[PDB]
Amino acid sequence: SMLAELITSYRKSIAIYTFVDTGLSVHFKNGTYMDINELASQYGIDYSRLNRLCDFLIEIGVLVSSNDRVALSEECRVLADPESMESLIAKWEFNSGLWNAWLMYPKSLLENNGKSAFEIANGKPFFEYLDSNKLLKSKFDSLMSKDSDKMIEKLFNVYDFNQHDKILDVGGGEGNLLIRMSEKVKEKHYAVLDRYNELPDYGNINFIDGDFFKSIPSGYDLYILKNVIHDWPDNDAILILENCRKAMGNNATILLITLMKKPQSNIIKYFDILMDVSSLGKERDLTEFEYLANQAGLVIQDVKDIDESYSIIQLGVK
Amino acid sequence: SMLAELITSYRKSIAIYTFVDTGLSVHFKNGTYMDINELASQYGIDYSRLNRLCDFLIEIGVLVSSNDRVALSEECRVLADPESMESLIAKWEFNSGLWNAWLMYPKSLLENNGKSAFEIANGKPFFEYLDSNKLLKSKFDSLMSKDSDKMIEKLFNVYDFNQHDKILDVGGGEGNLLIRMSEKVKEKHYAVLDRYNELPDYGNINFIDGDFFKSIPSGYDLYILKNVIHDWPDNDAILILENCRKAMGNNATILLITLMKKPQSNIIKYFDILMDVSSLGKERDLTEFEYLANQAGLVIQDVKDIDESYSIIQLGVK
Numbered sequence: 001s002m003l004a005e006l007i008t009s010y011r012k013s014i015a016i017y018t019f020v021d022t023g024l025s026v027h028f029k030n031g032t033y034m035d036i037n038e039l040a041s042q043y044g045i046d047y048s049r050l051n052r053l054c055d056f057l058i059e060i061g062v063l064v065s066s067n068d069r070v071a072l073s074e075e076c077r078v079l080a081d082p083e084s085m086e087s088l089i090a091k092w093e094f095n096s097g098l099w100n101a102w103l104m105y106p107k108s109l110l111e112n113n114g115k116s117a118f119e120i121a122n123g124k125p126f127f128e129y130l131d132s133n134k135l136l137k138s139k140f141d142s143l144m145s146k147d148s149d150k151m152i153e154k155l156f157n158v159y160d161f162n163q164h165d166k167i168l169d170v171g172g173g174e175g176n177l178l179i180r181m182s183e184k185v186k187e188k189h190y191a192v193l194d195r196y197n198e199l200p201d202y203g204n205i206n207f208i209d210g211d212f213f214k215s216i217p218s219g220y221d222l223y224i225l226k227n228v229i230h231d232w233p234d235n236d237a238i239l240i241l242e243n244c245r246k247a248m249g250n251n252a253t254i255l256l257i258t259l260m261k262k263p264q265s266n267i268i269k270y271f272d273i274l275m276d277v278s279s280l281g282k283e284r285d286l287t288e289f290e291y292l293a294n295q296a297g298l299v300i301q302d303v304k305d306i307d308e309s310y311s312i313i314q315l316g317v318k
Numbered sequence: 319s320m321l322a323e324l325i326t327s328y329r330k331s332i333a334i335y336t337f338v339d340t341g342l343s344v345h346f347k348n349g350t351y352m353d354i355n356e357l358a359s360q361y362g363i364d365y366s367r368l369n370r371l372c373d374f375l376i377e378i379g380v381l382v383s384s385n386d387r388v389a390l391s392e393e394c395r396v397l398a399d400p401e402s403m404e405s406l407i408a409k410w411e412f413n414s415g416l417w418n419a420w421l422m423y424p425k426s427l428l429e430n431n432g433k434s435a436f437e438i439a440n441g442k443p444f445f446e447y448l449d450s451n452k453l454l455k456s457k458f459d460s461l462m463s464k465d466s467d468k469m470i471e472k473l474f475n476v477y478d479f480n481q482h483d484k485i486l487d488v489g490g491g492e493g494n495l496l497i498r499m500s501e502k503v504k505e506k507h508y509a510v511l512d513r514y515n516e517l518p519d520y521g522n523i524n525f526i527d528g529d530f531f532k533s534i535p536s537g538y539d540l541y542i543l544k545n546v547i548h549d550w551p552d553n554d555a556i557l558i559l560e561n562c563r564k565a566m567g568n569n570a571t572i573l574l575i576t577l578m579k580k581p582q583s584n585i586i587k588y589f590d591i592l593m594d595v596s597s598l599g600k601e602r603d604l605t606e607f608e609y610l611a612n613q614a615g616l617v618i619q620d621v622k623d624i625d626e627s628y629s630i631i632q633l634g635v636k
């Protein structure tokens with residue numbers, strides 16, 4: 001039945017996770033056809049068990065078959081590229097911490113104690129958990145950087161970054177937004193604020209180890225908040241925006257790069273439940289963003305679509 | 319996108335898990351509409367968080383909406399019934415033991431050291447884990463009992479159980495197959511063999527605490543193996559059938575009630591990966607069953623369809 005299919009859908013996700021995690025995926029570049037017997041021998045996997053996994057991946061349209069040889073389907077070819085968005089999701093999404101968070105979604109709803117399903121499952125908030133696991137953080141950080149890679153060209157078209165001299169990426173992680181930005185937009189003071197166990201290095205980017213709940217570095221004319229605000233409950237989001245307001249000058253800009261609840265967005269509902277489970281975060285409409293801005297002592301000056309899901313919100317001091 | 323959607327489709331599974339586990343589903347009997355605010359108040363869930371879950375359940379076709387009011391979709395009305403197949407799956411499938419088994423699927427393939435993904439994840443094999451968790455075992459056993467409820471009518475008019483005097487259900491669990499069988503096939507000697515922390519009690523049914531790897535009781539003219547063989551690798555399946563051979567008389571019958579890889583067996587690959595991860599089990603075609611029987615000194619006398627996925631295989635002594 002349709003309902004039976006929905007309940008067992010998670011097995012499709014796990015089949016893809018397994019294909020990548022085993023190291024098999026990177027042998028299927030450019031829709032090339034592989035002998036399963038050969039792969040099984042190389043990796044010391046039982047042929048029959050590997051063939052049964054491939055049969056399932058054929059059934060769900062990830063693999064195609066021809067003369068006892070298997071290739072990635074046209075739509076799933078990106079899975080052979082380890083730097084593809086889909087590969088980076090497959091290498092992050094199924095980490096034991098986030099996987100177990102989902103089981104505590106019901107408990108997190110019934111308790112209503114300000115603890116996310118993730119914190120109930122793992123005994124630590126999401127970003128504390130990442131702070132304690134270097135390899136898992138690099139997998140998350142890599143996925144976030146790929147999001148900046150996919151958006152930078154769309155971003156240039158909707159906002160003139162060249163009008164700014166000093167730019168701070170607030171919660172910028174690896175700082176890939178500014179790395180990509182620095183390729184077209186030259187002779188700027190580029191800086192990134194995040195939580196770092198070790199400060200990263202890249203060109204003349206000023207990486208600052210800090211905490212946007214405590215303070216925001218002053219003296220920047222542009223403050224960028226990309227995929228930050230949706231992580232946080234209202235009060236936490238207001239504190240970040242308020243710390244930004246107190247740090248910034250009267251002629252300075254805050255630019256939110258954010259998913260926004262718009263009429264057509266299936267994808268925002270998937271992010272909404274992920275944000276809830278991960279950190280009691282949420283996706284917001286323009287009215288909810290207006291509320292955050294007003295509470296923080298800011299005003300929205302401009303709103304523009306980056307694409308169907310993503311938008312820029314330009315704020316100044318009220 | 320189609321690949322991205324397959325990777326995140328587990329969230330659909332968790333959404334239904336959550337809807338049942340919170341106890342929300344039983345509130346929606348007879349396709350009646352509910353106010354989401356009243357629902358939230360009844361269960362002490364934050365209204366906004368419950369609304370966001372409901373928006374996801376509408377998107378995936380579990381709920382239908384009329385403004386602030388939601389009802390179960392025609393296809394998902396069974397979630398209101400706590401005794402439905404889909405409800406019993408939702409209450410079993412997402413136990414932390416089996417959920418975490420899926421993460422160890424890649425390691426189980428690469429290790430190839432006779433240990434299931436379940437045993438790697440949980441530190442003990444599937445049926446040992448159920449031995450030590452009574453509440454979880456009752457949820458597993460209930461789901462198995464429902465499978466018997468579903469096929470007993472089709473099973474009656476495919477095999478004449480009335481021709482036998484003494485019947486043993488080997489790995490029969492709660493013994494629901496014989497319970498339901500006894501309703502229309504009366505004045506028989508019914509017996510169930512399984513591993514029990516406490517003996518079930520029903521009518522004249524002889525519940526026997528045993529281990530089908532060690533011995534099968536003698537003196538029954540019918541031995542039923544329903545949904546047992548597919549749990550086991552070839553060597554364990556042969557041993558079970560060997561123990562049935564050594565127990566049974568020359569005039570006695572073994573009846574395998576089993577999922578079979580046959581033409582128009584739609585959902586066999588889903589069960590196949592489940593059996594692999596759970597206990598290094600597998601689904602088999604008639605040839606593979608032929609091999610198991612021959613190795614255990616048995617002969618396939620008859621094969622018949624129960625439905626599109628389930629078959630009966632009639633065995634006698636070679």
Ligand SMILES: Nc1ncnc2c1ncn2[C@@H]1O[C@H](CSCC[C@H](N)C(=O)O)[C@@H](O)[C@H]1O
Pocket residue numbers: 127144145147148170171172173174193194195210211212213225226227228231
């Ligand atoms: N207290 C805090 N102070 C600063 N940065 C924080 C923080 N808590 C979380 N973050 C950072 O907020 C980021 C959210 S993910 C978004 C990353 C990046 N802006 C991008 O769009 O690709 C992470 O890099 C995380 O480390």
Ligand SMILES: Nc1ncnc2c1ncn2[C@@H]1O[C@H](CSCC[C@H](N)C(=O)O)[C@@H](O)[C@H]1O
Pocket residue numbers: 445462463465466488489490491492511512513528529530531543544545546549
């Ligand atoms: N060593 C063993 N000896 C006896 N029964 C065993 C066993 N290992 C597993 N089982 C039982 O095998 C069954 C597999 S599930 C199938 C149950 C039932 N025949 C039905 O079709 O609904 C479980 O009840 C489990 O407890």
Ligand SMILES: [Cl-]
Pocket residue numbers: 275276279280281282367
């Ligand atoms: Cl939330």
Ligand code: NA
Pocket residue numbers: 148169171172173174175176177178
């Ligand atoms: Na960045």
